[PDB]
């Protein structure tokens, strides 16, 4: 029938990917998309994303906007093929989005914006793309499920994942994605330009605690939420 | 009724929009879209493309890949909105566009990549982006008028138009801009990934000789051409 759209958000290292893939075996009725930048971290796509976070790790500053816009177009290809793709047979289906293009915008983009590696004019074209991009619709949220962590939690999941490139994230960075994450999704004092934002229904969960092997308190919450929508 | 779709198409300073403007005035059933670029050159979108025309002077293979992902948005639009706002209670409705999407990629984009002013990733992540953002359709050409001028007339165009930053254009540039729209539009030995392209009808006219106050001619081919559509 009708596809149910819910975003995963949360910082760096909070655990939605580890999350997605515990949900994803839960129902023939759920599917995941996972974050293409997170994909590139782990073809022609893969190989263009490669360089562009190796070409970020020495220069910021020259290809934040090159990276925010591949990263955003390869996002919204992977999120409408699923959705053109797969749950056609499926009752109750859910597709369950690692971040989205909100994220994407209001949460990465901003930030590099606000440490001087985009300047005005490569943000005004970012958001004005952003704009457009997203209305040549299908891809509106149903939920949004953040995952909450301390920025010291994230910190040490990072160390726990062990990617040599991240093992230099400092944590004044995560505590700045955190304070984003927070206004936009617990406060909800982040204005954005897509109206419908406003009211969408947020899950908030507390994954401070490892839940790997211990995750049914977290899935029932999700359920309980899922029938509200 | 259907509204005809025909690029006009052309060296810098050939006389497209002398022709474009020449030709909107003959017939209410006739509306042009102008090159983005070229209004640029002379509000948001405009401030935008002030500032990145004035930084590509100064480093073009800092600033192309951005130059050309925005000229090519900003056209998309501006000829989806005609397409969209335009024209509707016309018999015999024709849309002029100064230059296509495919200009933007196989004339220019094309000859920045091989000036070296963007790298092989801008130049994979631009084809990448390109092959999707023209199928995310209702823009595709029913003809393509070239009009046809020597480096040298074009030369000496830029000459009489008599912005500052052209004056320093050299011929060796516009030589390598006639190759390629020869290429493309009279020997058809470009290959492009719009298999529609290979077999689009082409009126080629001959603009060497003035035409500003003697374009009776030309029209007469429009004319007869559009009749064959
Ligand atoms: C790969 C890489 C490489 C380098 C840096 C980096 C290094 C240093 C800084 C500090 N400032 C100091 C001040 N200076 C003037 C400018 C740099 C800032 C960022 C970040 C990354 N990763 C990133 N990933 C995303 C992202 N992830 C998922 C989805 C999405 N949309 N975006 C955004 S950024
Ligand atoms: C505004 C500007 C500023 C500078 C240069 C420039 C300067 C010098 C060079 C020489 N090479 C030497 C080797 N070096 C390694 C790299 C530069 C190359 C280009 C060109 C422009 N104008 C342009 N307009 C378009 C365009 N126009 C309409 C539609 C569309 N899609 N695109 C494309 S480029
Ligand atoms: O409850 C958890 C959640 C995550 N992790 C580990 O923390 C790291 C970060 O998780 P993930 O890659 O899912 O984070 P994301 O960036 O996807 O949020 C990984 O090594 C996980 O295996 C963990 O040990 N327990
Ligand atoms: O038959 C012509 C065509 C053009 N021009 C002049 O040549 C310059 C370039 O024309 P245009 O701006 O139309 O060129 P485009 O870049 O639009 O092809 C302008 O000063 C025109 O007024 C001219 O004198 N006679
Ligand atoms: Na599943
Ligand atoms: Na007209």
Redesign the interface.
Known sequence: TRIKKISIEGNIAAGKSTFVNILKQLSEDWEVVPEPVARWSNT??Q??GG??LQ?MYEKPE?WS??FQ??AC?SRI?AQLASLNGKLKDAEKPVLFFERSVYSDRYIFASNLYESESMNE??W??YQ??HD?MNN?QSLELDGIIYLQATPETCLHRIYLRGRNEEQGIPLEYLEKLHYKHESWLLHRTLKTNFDYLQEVPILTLDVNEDFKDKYESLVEKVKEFLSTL
């Open positions: 022609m796509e190989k263009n360089n562009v070409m020259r906007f090159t816009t591949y177009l290809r004019t490569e005004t074209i004005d793309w457009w040549q």
